[PDB]
Design a protein around this nucleic acid. Structure first.
Ligand code: MG
Ligand code: MG
Ligand code: MG
Ligand code: MG
Ligand code: MG
Ligand code: MG
Ligand code: MG
Ligand code: MG
Ligand code: MG
Ligand code: MG
Ligand code: MG
Ligand code: MG
Ligand code: MG
Ligand code: MG
Ligand code: MG
Ligand code: MG
Ligand code: MG
Ligand code: MG
Ligand code: MG
Lengths: 88, 129
RNA sequence: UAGCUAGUAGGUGGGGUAACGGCUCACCUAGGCGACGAUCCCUAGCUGGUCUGAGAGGAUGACCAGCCACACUGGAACUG
RNA sequence: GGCGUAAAGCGCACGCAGGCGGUUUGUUAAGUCAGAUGUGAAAUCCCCGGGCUCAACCUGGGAACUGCAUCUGAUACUGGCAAGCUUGAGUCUCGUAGAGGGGGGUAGAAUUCCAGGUGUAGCGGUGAAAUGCGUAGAGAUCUGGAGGAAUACCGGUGGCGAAGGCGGCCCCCUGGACGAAGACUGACGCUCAGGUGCGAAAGCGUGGGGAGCAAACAGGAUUAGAUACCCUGGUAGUCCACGCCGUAAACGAUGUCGACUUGGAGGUUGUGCCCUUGAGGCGUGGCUUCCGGAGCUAACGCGUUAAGUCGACCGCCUGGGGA
RNA sequence: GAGGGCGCUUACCACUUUGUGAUUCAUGACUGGGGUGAAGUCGUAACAAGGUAACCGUAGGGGAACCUGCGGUUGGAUCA
RNA sequence: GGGAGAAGGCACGCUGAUAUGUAGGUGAGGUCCCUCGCGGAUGGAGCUGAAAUCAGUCGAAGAUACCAGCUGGCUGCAACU
């Protein structure tokens, strides 16, 4: 799925230090990265319905963190969608 | 999920009595702690403990008499999906006054007889016989 | 029957009204209702209560008493 | 009240609205509960009475009108706010098994057809037959060749998937699943009308493909008949692409999630400890099969993978025919 | 002279009219299925292994029940 | 896509005002920038100017002439140009 270096890089970039491996922002970047990577995969193949059901799980899970994030703290949510360029 | 911990307490009791278990244990909670107390005072269980600190474990020591379990029936009434409140003049009595109903009042959870003597109503948690 | 909606819903002012209000008029705003059933269609006068029912309901609203409504059909003022 | 078989769980999923919600302190007092004041026409109903000889009847005072509105209070519960909490949930690390998906490549068996050799009169088929094929040399056999489909053995109440479903081998991209320690977010969870996607086979559009099988079609038989079962042939279609269709006994005829309740023998896949002292041994986790205990059930049965014992949400049922 | 009233004149509107819709009740040659009987004709599909296991979905055929193809389920008998 | 100009209706001249000609459109002098010309913001003078609405006026008649669709329904055949 995702390589250890690209996850370790994101864990550094978005968490309170290197070990904040479960923060909300961390989770959503990790989800975003694989979602955008798979954009390439599913442009091709595309009949790979089984893999996509796995993808929709990643998306819907990403919204739940964002909605959870949006409430409990608002500046971090806003900062975050800007930083990843989603939402119109 | 565990959206009703009250049925869980009741049910662990109901099934353990049915299974001749000597005792039963479950995650604690203050509201649970108030129920084990009423049960002991009305002679339905021996004793209880809330051993644990961070992840408090509640313990009820069950009671048996003749080959029978002291608890004949114990069922949840009000419930997250359909809450039941009564005043004072509408307070149910269980088994025609035999047994008890556990009620939550403005001055806390007690049996109907006690709440009656104090002229109050509340959310009726269960019936016990 | 799933969308209904231009005096439509809000505004400023003129009138009007025993009295407030789109009551009405010009003038701005583009809103308002509705899935918590809007509109549409079918039906019906409403209640106290009545019959049944352990009860909860179900049915129902002659006689009695309370409110609305009509007065050969439709439209209109007039007087007080 | 119900939905394994009587009528009834949507074929499966994700998911907005919606309904539901773990645990500690604090606050708030909306829902709640207690007190009151106003109100709830009277008649009626009821209670205790009076009254006409009784009684219908009439009536007196009280009950009750359980509702509402406000007001002063209660804080256990539910809720709204704040601060948290790690045991639900999710992330990270190392790993294990698998017909999970999508694409590309390739391999060896087989059947069909074309070319060729040898060889002689039958092959073939059936209950028996005949159609058919064969002296223009079939069939049988050897050789070379073309092409499509499917992947023997392993192969297993074996494995994976949310169902549909997915099996030769290699790679590429890719989803889920489980175990071990440990760290991290800190209620982010459950469920879903609508909606959205998936969805066997057959069918359909367009263009490719076509060996084998085979609706239709045709022949030969069987038969009282024989629009069939059998036989000789055979078109769609089965195959690929892309797009529809949206259905099946889509079944466990059992919706999803979480908690609790005696046991026995296996299969499968993790992992700790053990002298692997040698196939073994004991533990702890995941999935699964069979039998069963209580209980449940109308019975049949189900029986820790419930049809037991509770809990939140959904779907759906209301005599048969007609339909 | 005010002012009134009058009559006319504008607005609004009922009775009524023209074109066009939508909805309902009744009816209609002919026509599709559906139901019921008197126990007719034809057959004999299902029930037993129902004499070709049965059914679901689907597609084609066929006087009819039905036969046949593909997949699925057991709610199929017989399994030394 | 259509059918559709379906079908069927209200409008129509003239005049004053709102505004002695409004919106617009065209765009002078002034001015200032000019890397200075066939150059440029500022500028709104003058020119030109449709409809619209309030109110009047007229004949029998205001799309007044020329000019310029008849429209609707059942059906045969052929796709269509
Ligand atoms: Mg993987
Ligand atoms: Mg005003
Ligand atoms: Mg009426
Ligand atoms: Mg009854
Ligand atoms: Mg009238
Ligand atoms: Mg029933
Ligand atoms: Mg059935
Ligand atoms: Mg199901
Ligand atoms: Mg009264
Ligand atoms: Mg008397
Ligand atoms: Mg609270
Ligand atoms: Mg095709
Ligand atoms: Mg055949
Ligand atoms: Mg169905
Ligand atoms: Mg069993
Ligand atoms: Mg038969
Ligand atoms: Mg048969
Ligand atoms: Mg078959
Ligand atoms: Mg022609």
């Amino acid at each position: 799925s995702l390589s250890t270096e690209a996850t370790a890089k994101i864990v550094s970039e978005f968490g309170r230090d290197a070990n904040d491996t479960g923060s909300t922002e961390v989770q959503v970047a990790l989800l975003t990265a694989q979602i955008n990577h798979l954009q390439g995969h599913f442009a091709e193949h595309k009949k790979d319905h089984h893999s996509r059901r796995g993808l929709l799980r990643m998306v819907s899970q990403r919204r739940k963190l964002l909605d959870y994030l949006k409430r409990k703290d608002v500046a971090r949510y806003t900062r975050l969608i800007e930083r990843l360029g989603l939402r119109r | 999920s565990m959206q009703d911990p009250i049925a869980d307490m009741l049910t662990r009791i109901r099934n353990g009595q049915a299974a001749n278990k000597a005792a039963v244990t479950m995650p604690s909670s203050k509201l649970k702690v108030a129920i084990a107390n009423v049960l002991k005072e009305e002679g339905f269980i021996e004793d209880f403990k809330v051993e644990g600190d961070t992840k408090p474990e509640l313990e009820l020591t069950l009671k048996y008499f003749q080959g029978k379990a002291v608890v004949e029936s114990i069922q949840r009434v009000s419930r997250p999906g359909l809450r039941i409140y009564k005043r004072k003049d509408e307070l149910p009595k269980v088994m025609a006054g035999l047994g008890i109903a556990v009620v939550s009042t403005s001055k806390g959870v007690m049996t109907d007889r006690a709440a009656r003597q104090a002229g109050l109503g509340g959310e009726i948690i269960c019936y016990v016989a």
